[PDB]
């Protein structure tokens, strides 16, 4: 049913952003090790590039699956053409906010990396930048979860107005 479609897409998108955040946090703590050889540094960048690509692919896959389920509902007549419009617009918006969160996380991780390379070597002065990145990443996770629930909640309330 149309309500389960938007809900499932929202949970999946939020979940992929949480996976991305946890990887970037984990990669940034390894970039803190003083024994980090240039070999490990190359591998952390490859893991960061792969994590971003995976999040992009996985978020998009959830949205395409959701749109396909939405089109199945209107052809089965379980949803009229105005309700399909609303569900597709809500899936488009979820893709937008999830994609922004992914881009945000990538940019902040890059900024956090660049700061580590200009900061000192001791634990203090850039565990600060590590804590900061974790702090920003949690805020992005929470805001996306809030928007995902809130947007699905509002989709339901406006369906009745159709």
Is 79 or 86 the residue whose CB approaches other proteins more closely?
86
154 binds other proteins per the rule CB under 8 A: yes
Is 119 or 145 the residue whose CB approaches other proteins more closely?
145
Stretch that binds other proteins, among 26-34, 76-84, 106-114, 122-130 (CB under 8 A): 106-114
Structure tokens at 138: 């949690």
Per-residue interface string for the shown chain with other proteins, residues 112-141, x marking contact by CB under 8 A: -----------------------xx-xxx-
Give me the least distance between CB of 13 and other proteins, in Å please: 11
Q: In sequence order, what DSSP letters do the residues of 89-154 get, joined into one string?
A: HHHHHHHHHHHHHHHHHHHHHHHHHHHHHHS-SSSHHHHHHHHHHHHHHHHHHHHHHHHHHHHHHH
Stretch that binds other proteins, among 25-33, 81-89, 104-112, 116-124 (CB under 8 A): 104-112
Binding to other proteins in span 2-41, by CB under 8 A: 7, 10-11, 14
Classify residue 53 by burial, with Cβ atoms within 10 Å: 0-12, 13-18, 19+.
exposed
Residues belonging to the chain: 162
Is residue 120 within 8 Å of residue 126, measured between CB atoms? yes
For residue 87, what is the enclosing H or E element?
helix 81-118
Chain contacts with other proteins (rule: CB under 8 A) = 7, 10-11, 14, 43, 45-54, 56-62, 64-65, 68, 93, 95-97, 99-104, 106-107, 110, 135-136, 138-140, 142-155, 157-158, 160-161
């Amino acid at each position: 049913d149309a309500k389960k479609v938007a809900k499932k897409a929202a949970i999946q998108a939020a979940r992929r952003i949480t996976e991305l955040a946890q990887v970037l946090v984990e990669l940034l703590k390894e970039a803190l090790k003083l024994d980090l050889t240039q070999e490990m540094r190359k591998k952390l960048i490859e893991r960061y590039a792969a994590a971003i690509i995976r999040a992009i692919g996985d978020i998009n896959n959830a949205i395409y699956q959701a749109k396909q389920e939405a089109e199945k509902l209107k052809k089965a007549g379980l949803v009229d053409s105005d309700q399909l419009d609303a569900l597709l617009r809500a899936l488009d918006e979820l893709q937008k906010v999830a994609s922004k969160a992914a881009n945000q996380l990538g940019r902040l991780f890059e900024e956090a990396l660049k700061r580590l390379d200009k900061d000192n070597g001791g634990e203090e002065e850039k565990d600060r930048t590590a804590k900061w990145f974790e702090f920003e990443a949690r805020a992005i996770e929470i805001a996306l979860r809030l928007a995902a629930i809130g947007d699905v909640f509002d989709l339901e309330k406006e369906w009745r107005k159709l």
